[PDB]
Design a protein around this ligand. Structure first.
Ligand SMILES: Cn1cc(-c2c[nH]c(=O)c(N)c2)cn1
Length: 255
């Protein structure tokens, strides 16, 4: 019902999420202000697992100064036992917002799409590739989208956003993140994932790999959006659109 971080006393409002070792809480400070505290319990965590959390914190602290589209981290407490991260509190996650919403206004969709490329572009500049991108790594705060996960540590489980190169890499580049964002935008346009209809997961993996499989892009009034979707969802990483290219596309730029 209460926890301390760097002397500061935060009273727990509710629990948002959990990822086994982790637990996220909606808390309030002394002045009734809202924050979200991530709690990690290192008691049973391994040497490799600890450096993944040590790495994610470092980047999440550095990269905060490089984009308003990356989740704010106000403070943190690290000991051998736990990790207390005091971050900004969002309205709702993108996955929950999309699963709820029936309609998606073109002006909102385009705005969110710009927020994502800005975050994803920031991380790529510091040599980070997320790889596992899903609407859950995004969070609506002050009507603006923000990146919570850098895909470094363990996230607090849909196969609908997997890049083809990843499935074929069983025997990862920035183009892997383009495919995944392409799938989040497609689902923001057509209401469903590109391979969301393929019930069997073994077969769903067969589809993403197979080039003789044609992905559907129904005729939309937003001409540029359909071209964005056709460029992001190119199976060959070499022939796929880049993040600096998407940022200079007519979809993002033309008003
Ligand atoms: C890195 N990380 C940020 C969060 C988080 C921060 N703020 C929130 O509002 C939320 N739902 C989640 C969880 N993990």
């Amino acid at each position: 019902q209460s926890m301390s971080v760097k002397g500061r006393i935060y009273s727990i409002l509710k629990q948002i999420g959990s990822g086994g070792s982790s637990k996220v809480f909606q808390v309030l400070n002394e002045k009734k202000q809202i924050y979200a505290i991530k709690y990690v319990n290192l008691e049973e965590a391994d040497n490799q697992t600890l450096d993944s959390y040590r790495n994610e914190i470092a980047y999440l602290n550095k990269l905060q100064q490089h984009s308003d589209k990356i989740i704010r981290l106000y403070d943190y407490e690290i000991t051998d036992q736990y990790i207390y991260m005091v971050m900004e509190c969002g309205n709702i996650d993108l996955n929950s917002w999309l699963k709820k919403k029936k309609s998606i206004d073109p002006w909102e969709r385009k705005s969110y799409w710009k927020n994502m490329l800005e975050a994803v572009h920031t991380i790529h500049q510091h040599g980070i590739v997320h790889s596992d991108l899903k609407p859950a790594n995004f969070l609506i705060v002050d009507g603006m989208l923000k990146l919570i996960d850098f895909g470094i540590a363990n996230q607090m489980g849909t196969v609908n956003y997997m890049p083809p190169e990843a499935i074929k890499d069983m025997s990862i580049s920035p183009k892997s993140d383009v495919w995944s964002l392409g799938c989040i935008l497609y689902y923001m346009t057509y209401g469903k994932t590109p391979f969301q209809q393929i019930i069997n997961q073994i077969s769903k993996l067969h589809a993403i790999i197979d080039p003789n499989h044609e992905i559907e892009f129904p005729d939309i009034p937003e001409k540029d959006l359909q071209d964005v979707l056709k460029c992001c969802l190119k199976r060959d990483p070499k022939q796929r659109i880049s993040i600096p290219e998407l940022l200079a596309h007519p979809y993002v730029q033309i008003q």
